[PDB]
Amino acid sequence: DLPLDPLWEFPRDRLVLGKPLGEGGQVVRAEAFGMDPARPDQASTVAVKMLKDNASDKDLADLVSEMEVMKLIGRHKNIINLLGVCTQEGPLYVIVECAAKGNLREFLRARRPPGSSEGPLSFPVLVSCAYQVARGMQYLESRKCIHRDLAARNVLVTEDNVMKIADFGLPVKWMAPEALFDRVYTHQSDVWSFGILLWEIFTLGGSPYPGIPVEELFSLLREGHRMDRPPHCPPELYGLMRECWHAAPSQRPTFKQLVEALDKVLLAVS
């Protein structure tokens, strides 16, 4: 039973629902008509979150929360953006961008060359992915958003291969020490996760701490151990991973610094 926000209300009759992308609440693919009000006939493919009939007063407040948080954070090329909402005379729909090529883990895994051969993702394309994620996090950070669960599974990829951070408005191998032990999340804890994300990228969607069982990880970290440089990963990049994986959060680089460092590498191609 909700207010009508004229900046975001989109007509429910202009949103043709399609194939479900996820159940668990649910998320549905949809063709929206005139998300660009420049060309109001033009169709675009979008995603839509909504509640299932099996859902409490609480679940509604969460979806309202995420919606409202997304309005407040605002727009950036490197996050999944809010596009509109449907709040009146019918169920809550939160409408957002739909990334054509799915999440970043699966994008990279489906692009692994066989064995020692060379694959379609060049080094610059991979550093580019990492830079784009860094820019998105820098932006979310500048809007006081702590992600808490940054990982390749939570970055999505557009048709034009643009990284878009997902689920920012609401996993032990991705978590910083202070988050694991002390249940403390900060921007710096997101930085730790970005390091892990970096290793994911340069392993084409590798499973972090390969071998090591989850219960034996917390002690490997305490001893000062970290993942090894992956094969073919240059040391400038490996070094960033490692700076992200410092135990003291203040000793980790900021997202600003991550963006600059990654920028240097991309400038240093040609």
Ligand X SMILES: *CCC(=O)Nc1cccc(F)c1Nc1ncc(OCc2c(Cl)c(OC)cc(OC)c2Cl)cn1
User: Nearest to residue 52, comparing CAs of 42, 60, 61, 43?
Assistant: 60
> Is 158 near ligand X (CB under 6 A)?
no
String marking each residue 69-108 x if it binds ligand X according to CB under 6 A: -----------x-------------x-x-xxx-xx-----
Please report, in range form, the residues annotated as the binding site.
21-27, 49
Q: Which residue is nearest to ligand X (CB)?
A: 98
Calculate ∠ Cα 127-132-129, nearest 5°.
35
- Find the shortest distance in angstroms from Cβ 48 to ligand X: 6
User: Nearest to residue 135, comparing CAs of 269, 10, 261, 221?
Assistant: 261
Query: Are 111 and 120 within 8 A, CB to CB?
Result: yes
User: Is 149 one of the catalytic residues?
Assistant: yes
> Is 139 near ligand X (CB under 6 A)?
no
Per-residue exposure over 199-223, b if at least 16 CB sit within 10 Å of its own CB, e if not: bbbbbbbbebbeeeeeeebeeebee
Q: Which amino acid is at 252?
A: R
Catalytic residue among 13, 36, 53, 149: 149
**Given candidates 66, 68, 243, 260, which one binds ligand X under the rule CB under 6 A?**
66
Please report, in range form, the residues annotated as the binding site for ATP.
21-27, 49
Query: What is the rounded distance in angstroms from the CA atom of residue 218 to the CA atom of residue 32?
Result: 46
**Given candidates 8, 93, 107, 168, which one binds ligand X under the rule CB under 6 A?**
168
Residues in contact with ligand X by CB under 6 A are 21, 27, 29, 45, 47, 49, 66, 80, 94, 96, 98-100, 102-103, 156, 166-169
Residues with catalytic roles: 149
